[PDB]
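Hi D.,

Good news: the full-assembly prediction came through. Inputs first.
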Amino acid sequence: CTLIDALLGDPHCDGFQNEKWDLFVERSKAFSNCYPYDVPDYASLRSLVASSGTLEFINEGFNWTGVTQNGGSSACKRGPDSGFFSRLNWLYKSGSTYPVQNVTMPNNDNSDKLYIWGVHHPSTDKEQTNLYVQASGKVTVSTKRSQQTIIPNVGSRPWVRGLSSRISIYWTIVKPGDILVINSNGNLIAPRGYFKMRTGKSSIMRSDAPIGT
Amino acid sequence: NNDNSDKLYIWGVHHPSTDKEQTNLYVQASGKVTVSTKRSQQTIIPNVGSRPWVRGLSSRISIYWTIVKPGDILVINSNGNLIAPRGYFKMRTGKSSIMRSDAPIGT
Amino acid sequence: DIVMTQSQKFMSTSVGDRVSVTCKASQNVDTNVAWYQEKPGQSPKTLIYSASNRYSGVPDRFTGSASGTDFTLTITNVQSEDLAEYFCQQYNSYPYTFGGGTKLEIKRADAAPTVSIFPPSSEQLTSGGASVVCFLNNFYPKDINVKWKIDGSERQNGVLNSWTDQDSKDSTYSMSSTLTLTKDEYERHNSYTCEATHKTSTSPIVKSFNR
Amino acid sequence: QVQLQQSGTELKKPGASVKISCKATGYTFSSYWIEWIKQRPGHGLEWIGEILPEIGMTNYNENFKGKATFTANTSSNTVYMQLSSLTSEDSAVYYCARPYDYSWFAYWGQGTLVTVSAAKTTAPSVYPLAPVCGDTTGSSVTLGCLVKGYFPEPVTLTWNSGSLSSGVHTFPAVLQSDLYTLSSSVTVTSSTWPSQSITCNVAHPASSTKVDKKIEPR
Ligand SMILES: *[C@@H]1O[C@H](CO)[C@@H](O[C@@H]2O[C@H](CO)[C@@H](O[C@@H]3O[C@H](CO[C@H]4O[C@H](CO)[C@@H](O)[C@H](O)[C@@H]4O)[C@@H](O)[C@H](O[C@H]4O[C@H](CO)[C@@H](O)[C@H](O)[C@@H]4O)[C@@H]3O)[C@H](O)[C@H]2NC(C)=O)[C@H](O)[C@H]1NC(C)=O
Ligand SMILES: *[C@@H]1O[C@H](CO)[C@@H](O[C@@H]2O[C@H](CO)[C@@H](O[C@@H]3O[C@H](CO[C@H]4O[C@H](CO)[C@@H](O)[C@H](O)[C@@H]4O)[C@@H](O)[C@H](O[C@H]4O[C@H](CO)[C@@H](O)[C@H](O)[C@@H]4O)[C@@H]3O)[C@H](O)[C@H]2NC(C)=O)[C@H](O)[C@H]1NC(C)=O
Ligand SMILES: *[C@@H]1O[C@H](CO)[C@@H](O[C@@H]2O[C@H](CO)[C@@H](O)[C@H](O)[C@H]2NC(C)=O)[C@H](O)[C@H]1NC(C)=O
Ligand SMILES: *[C@@H]1O[C@H](CO)[C@@H](O)[C@H](O)[C@H]1NC(C)=O
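Then the structure:
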């Protein structure tokens, strides 16, 4: 497992749930077994998580309305059956509609919350509509002082683990007193909760050196 | 990329000045270009509008690049506005670099 | 879940006349409702969508309508080929739910039960059983009575009755009545008869045969 | 033209499992959901769920969770549904259907019958019924076919391989002592019989039996 896959919850990484480290060691033999994805500014996400030094995850119910939750795929197989990143919730249509999605998560706690979310890029327009109804999806994740709007883009990408489609991963940090707001007319890969952020001596290293006592 | 080394692809997107110009060229009113590999992607949306007259044109071309390592694959997807690559530039590593100077070269 | 209620299990109409099937969603489905026609033994076929819209290839007779949670499938000028079961579906949200179905039934002019009787075959007697078969064909209304007579004596033991869906051409019910016995018992008597009492004649229609 | 071809009839002992297939042809396979619908003889139509083939996303009716599993073979353009831990409650006709695009149903399959019981397969006896010893009582003549003592459903019965359609009445099967029985009548013109050849064709695939019986005059 790479640190990011452990973060996201790729099934073969599920051992790493809620783990802690001073030093996370990434091996060269690591590989991704789940829905093919990418992280814009991968380096930064990797850094800030490595530095936080904990994967501790705290669940939160978001009030989603009139959409199916827990979408999954055969590209990401958990056990015998189809699956998906454990920390992400794939939302899609209920029947003939994907109601615009507008939700809030205040941070009333003592520390910072790290939210990992995503946008789905379908391969064909058919795939877009079969999932989200509307031909053009969109996701805006915001706080009081900052915002991100991602527009998903339909098109083909190299075949990977079965799919020509992709997921783009994004993150939002919410300080205490701030509020998270998620707004989507579809294509949203929703967070299931937050990762606790810590400061300290933690970091990450790439090495093939055996660990020893 | 079945070769031994990295490929550097240079491509572009065309931004027309008027909607008429968009349709006269691409049919569809809104073009789009997605250039991707296995682990990375770029989607550029062209934007119609006016820019300062330069060498006759109020329109523009935006240049982008994609590097493709051996074993990877390039995939180009466009409903129009794409300025397409004709091939790749070979990538090398070494002592090369670039300098801005008006100093004459001499033997 | 959303319940789609079709309160009419059976509808009565006559050819050329007008008929309406009702379906009531138990909570708002908006206008997303489809109507399907299932004929006997075939697969469902699509009639209506968006509650008012005619699917291609569907005759202009069929029209859907909606008011609030009330959806109505109306057929004007009912034909005989229209004999079938009618389902409504809300595709608004998951899970997709269906109505109970409404079987369309026809009323036509009274018709006489053409009667035919059949004796046991050879292959069956070589097998050791024997079955007297009596067909009562193309009659109306559905209500009918068939009585089995052996040597002029009533027999209820071993009768098997099968009625058919109302016919799609002439709109008449028919029914098959088989009468089963042992080989030795069938040879133990001579006369075999069936009597069909129906609305079309004051007295029974009698068909019979003798060994 | 769009076609959804389902698999053959199935008979299964209680507690076993079954995989029904739906083969899609005449449209791009990946562009549409595939739906599964169950029909029992007194319960009408229940929605099992849907699967979107490319990405193998499965969406089930809460009531079928654990009973039913969809899968897709994108190379064979086929969608499979698997039913497990079978009970008699799962005996029904199963349909697969394709939406017009994303919601309401446009195209249906021909259906797959699934029967569940501990019972053993029994081939039917097929008997000709030629009219009584005698002479023409009118302008037409009625002949028949008795298909007796079989299990399970269905059986399929045609006359002259389908060349006789009108004037055929096939009667629904009646169940007596755990064995099904049906019969069929065909009425033709006094001209056409005995002078021409009348034959009834009974097939019972679950028994691997197929027979043709000409009605001979007595
Ligand atoms: C836009 O254009 C692209 C490019 O043409 C299309 O993307 C292709 O989609 C096809 C169809 O699925 C892909 O074909 C599949 O490739 C799989 C990948 O295996 C590769 O790797 C091994 C090892 O190097 C090679 O030997 C092999 O040749 C491939 O390079 C195969 O595993 C698949 O094979 C499976 O199915 C076939 C039947 O189709 C079976 O015979 C096999 O047994 C096996 O089960 C399959 O061949 C192809 O990879 C895609 N190209 C790329 C690079 O993305 C898009 O489809 C197109 N978009 C649209 C919708 O128009
Ligand atoms: C949106 O708004 C913009 C701004 O108004 C419009 O863009 C203008 O388009 C006009 C029409 O072509 C341009 O006019 C041309 O300017 C050329 C540039 O030369 C400049 O530089 C020299 C040196 O400084 C100056 O002396 C000169 O005045 C200019 O500033 C000229 O070369 C062109 O002249 C040619 O054609 C004329 C006839 O039209 C001849 O008389 C000349 O001999 C010569 O052959 C011409 O004047 C203008 O530059 C654009 N402005 C800018 C800054 O972009 C868009 O058109 C408008 N969009 C729409 C479609 O509504
Ligand atoms: C999906 O279907 C394909 C095609 O029917 C199957 O691939 C076949 O596999 C068998 C042996 O396993 C061969 O005899 C065929 O010739 C293969 N077809 C080709 C050329 O690919 C595949 O096994 C199926 N997979 C599933 C989901 O069961
Ligand atoms: C969830 O959101 C809906 C729609 O805004 C609202 O009506 C409802 O009160 C919310 N439900 C709960 C339990 O918070």
